Amino acid sequence: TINQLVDSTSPSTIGIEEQVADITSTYKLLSTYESESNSFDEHIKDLKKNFKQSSD
């Protein structure tokens, strides 16, 4: 999307700052979701280890 955004956008036309900012927020949100899932998996691993130790 970045490459094609450079490819298409007319350098004489301004108004891409809002597009880039919105996709910036979107990608930060998506990276946040990925990080949430990563920490969720890490918490799952630690929780599983602790639960197994306590149950045993």
């Binding site: 490459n3 094609q4 490819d7 298409s8």
Partner: protein, 45 residues
């Protein structure tokens, strides 16, 4: 991306307004009339 390729092709309507295009006749037509002005009279007729 597909529309990117299409719009790059539309920039290659560079030939689209460049290759298709005024004064070649204009420069020469002057020479045609200027040469023919000395050639030519209704008063004589």
């Amino acid at each position: 991306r597909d529309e990117v390729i299409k719009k790059k092709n539309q920039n290659e309507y560079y030939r689209g307004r460049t290759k298709k295009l005024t004064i070649i006749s204009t420069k020469e037509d002057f020479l045609r009339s200027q040469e023919i002005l000395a050639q030519t009279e209704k008063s004589v007729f």
